[PDB]
Amino acid sequence: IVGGYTCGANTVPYQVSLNSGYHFCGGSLINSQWVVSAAHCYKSGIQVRLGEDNINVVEGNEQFISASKSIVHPSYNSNTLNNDIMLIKLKSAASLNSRVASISLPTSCASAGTQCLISGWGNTKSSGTSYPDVLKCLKAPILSDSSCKSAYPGQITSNMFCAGYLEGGKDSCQGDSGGPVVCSGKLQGIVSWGSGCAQKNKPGVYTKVCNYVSWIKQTIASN
Ligand SMILES: [Ca+2]
């Protein structure tokens, strides 16, 4: 997260870190057994780390649970990033309390102008590289479809939305991938892609979670 703020420990209780020897992506806990992330975050041997603030220090609220199975969206295209969503099942159910909690799925899509919270452990610099140990947060609005398409001609599908600031300086970034965009207590987006980070006229692009609720529910019901 570039141009954000330190969230505070366990203030984003649905945020998870996906670990394969190291943090590599975010995700969102949506029930005791399941995490939503980006399909571009797929790999084998994932450990889901819940209850994290400092990802390099054991601070007392962590639950580390291996994934039993990952399900990339059936129509994910890794070239275009269309349908950039994946479900991850935990081998055992997480213990839920106020520091580790699920986030609700949307029942309606969010509109441009809605304010959201984007979070993660990704790079905090728009030029060069600095990875934080503690969770970072950014409040940002959803942008209009027309501004999003104008920013990224030929690239924005009906399964994507832009959020952030056209002036630059405030965005998600590498290592935030897969993490949440939460608006009015609902998971509306997944950190997906963008041109660099925090660049002028190049806002963040997010997977439009409301399009996937049917798939998520039916997949959980049978897996
Ligand atoms: Ca920790």
Swiss-Prot record:
Cystine bridges: C7-C137, C25-C41, C109-C210, C116-C183, C148-C162, C173-C197
Subunit structure comment from the entry: Interacts with SERPINA1.
Gene3D superfamilies documented for this protein: Trypsin-like serine proteases (2.40.10.10)
Domain of life from the UniProt record: Eukaryota
Enzyme type, top EC level: hydrolase
GO biological process, one term: digestion
Residues that coordinate or bind Ca(2+): E52, N54, V57, E62
Tissue: Synthesized in the acinar cells of the pancreas.
Organism: Bos taurus
Gene name, Swiss-Prot/TrEMBL: PRSS1
Keyword terms, alphabetized: Calcium, Digestion, Disulfide bond, Hydrolase, Metal-binding, Protease, Secreted, Serine protease, Signal, Zymogen
Binding site for substrate: D171, S172, Q174, G175, S177
InterPro entries referenced in this protein's UniProt entry, alphabetically: Peptidase_S1_PA, Peptidase_S1_PA_chymotrypsin, Peptidase_S1A, Serine_Proteases_S1, Trypsin_dom, TRYPSIN_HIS, TRYPSIN_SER
Modulation of this protein's activity: Is inhibited by scorpion cyclotide trypsin inhibitor TopI1.
Cellular component GO terms, alphabetical: extracellular space; serine protease inhibitor complex
Secreted found in the keyword field: yes
Modification after translation: Subsequent cleavage after Lys-125 leads to alpha-trypsin. Further cleavage after Lys-170 yields pseudotrypsin. A cleavage may also occur after Arg-99.
Protein's UniProt keywords contain Disulfide bond: yes
Cofactor binding description: Binds 1 Ca(2+) ion per subunit.
Residues annotated as the enzyme's active site: H40, D84, S177
Record protein name field: Serine protease 1
Cofactors (names): Ca(2+)
Matching CDD domains: Tryp_SPc
The Peptidase S1 domain, residue ranges: 1-221
Catalytic activity: Preferential cleavage: Arg-|-Xaa, Lys-|-Xaa
One annotated GO molecular function: endopeptidase activity
UniProt cross-references to PANTHER family, sorted A to Z: RIKEN CDNA 2210010C04 GENE, TRYPSIN-RELATED
Enzyme Commission no: 3.4.21.4
